[PDB]
């Protein structure tokens, strides 16, 4: 019974670990996108200025 609960609890660990890994992969994907977007938001803010400068010029 404990083993059956263990198997299910382990299954939950696996399902939850599954989700953990999936979220981790999504976390990293999103975080990697965050980072590329941090780079883009800054490059874009810089472009906001390069373009603003092209307008000023």
């Amino acid at each position: 019974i404990i083993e059956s609960d263990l198997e299910r609890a382990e299954e939950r660990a696996e399902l939850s670990e599954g989700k953990c890994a999936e979220l981790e992969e999504e976390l990293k994907t999103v975080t990697n996108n965050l980072k590329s977007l941090e780079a883009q938001a800054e490059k874009y803010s810089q472009k906001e200025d390069r373009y603003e400068e092209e307008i000023k010029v």
Binding site: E25, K28, T29, N32, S36
Partner: protein, 375 residues
């Protein structure tokens, strides 16, 4: 079990058949396109045991079965096995009686007419469907994604169709039909895992490698940087549990497999690669079209889920593209499922209600009707 005569939607790939009813945002279940057969002689009496197993049955009892797929790069060549897959899908799991529902099937626009004619024939002649439509996968991902324009790149299990659409129109001279998909990537991985000391040949082994790829692999934004690193350090290895308690670790093979999509030469294929075929589909379109397709590089199907692929494809096209042009990938979560989803949306559109082939039209017109009514 449905309370309305909603159209049924089934996306029949070389991998899995996604199926459910029109109006939902997901299939009820995914039915691997597999029919299994025992490869051993029975010894015990009173064991039941059938000549064949289908879909999830085929995978669940796979330890003693040889498993085969009826679909070859998008075309069904084994119709007996697809009738079993379709029957199981409707009869046991979707809890559907096609006799009372229109059915929408999907297909690459570039496949032989024999497949679209035969799919139309089986739903009308074997399943007695009141109506049919076979839809284009470029179209279906675009509906699911909320787009009318873009290059649709499937990179699926079977085929990559590379089809540019503008304002809902096909631009056929710019289409790059490509004989490269996940089924080839899997075979490549089996050969490089053999190099590591793990030989994968038989069905159980083939299904394990497909599972390894699905859980461990990525394309890499920059292949050479990952290559050099993974080949130099264990910090890039990822483990996988084999069903018997043994384990395998995978290093640069983790990306060398997916890389074949960008480098087809890895499996002996003569091809531009998915980033060049995508590029050429943009490039071959008219000059006033190019800007809209550059901004709408549209994902479809699986493998588009690999880490680094949405960023890599955008970079690879940008590197080939003219300046000024803004290049963007549309990579929605409706990934690996967008073709089925598009089928749900399409089947349900008021503007599509007259696009359905009815049973009476089919019987009078014959099977060639799919050429005049669908595409």
């Amino acid at each position: 079990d449905e309370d309305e005569t909603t159209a049924l939607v089934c996306d029949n790939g070389s991998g899995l058949v996604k199926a459910g009813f029109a109006g939902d945002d997901a299939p009820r279940a995914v039915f691997p396109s597999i029919v299994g057969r025992p490869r051993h002689q029975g010894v015990m009496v009173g064991m039941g045991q059938k000549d064949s197993y289908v879909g999830d049955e085929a995978q669940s009892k796979r330890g003693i079965l040889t498993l085969k797929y009826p679909i070859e790069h998008g075309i069904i060549t084994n119709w007996d096995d697809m009738e079993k897959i379709w029957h199981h899908t409707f009869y046991n799991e979707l809890r559907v009686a096609p006799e009372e529902h229109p059915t929408l099937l999907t297909e690459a626009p570039l496949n032989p007419k024999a497949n679209r004619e035969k799919m139309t024939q089986i739903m009308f002649e074997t399943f007695n469907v009141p109506a049919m439509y076979v839809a284009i996968q470029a179209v279906l991902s675009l509906y699911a994604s909320g787009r009318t324009t873009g290059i649709v790149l499937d990179s699926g299990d079977g085929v990559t169709h590379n089809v540019p659409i503008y304002e809902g129109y096909a631009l056929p001279h710019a289409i790059m039909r490509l004989d490269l998909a996940g089924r080839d990537l899997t075979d490549y991985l089996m050969k490089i895992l053999t190099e590591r000391g793990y030989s994968f040949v038989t069905t159980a082994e083939r299904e394990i490698v497909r599972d390894i790829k699905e859980k461990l692999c990525y394309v890499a934004l920059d292949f050479e940087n990952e290559m050099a690193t993974a080949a130099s350090s264990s910090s890039l290895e990822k483990s996988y549990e084999l069903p018997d308690g043994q384990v395998i670790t995978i290093g640069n093979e983790r990306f060398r497999c997916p890389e074949t999509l960008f480098q087809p030469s890895f499996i002996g294929m003569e091809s531009a690669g998915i980033h060049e075929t995508t590029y050429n589909s943009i490039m071959k379109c008219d000059i006033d079209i190019r800007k809209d397709l550059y901004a709408n590089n549209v994902m479809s199907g699986g493998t588009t889920m690999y880490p680094g692929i949405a960023d890599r494809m955008q970079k690879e096209i940008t590197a080939l593209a003219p300046s000024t042009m803004k290049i963007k990938i549309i990579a929605p979560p409706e990934r690996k499922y967008s073709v089925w989803i598009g089928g749900s949306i399409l089947a349900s559109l008021s503007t599509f209600q007259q696009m359905w082939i009815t049973k009476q039209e089919y019987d009078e017109a014959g099977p060639s009707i799919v050429h005049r009514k669908c595409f």
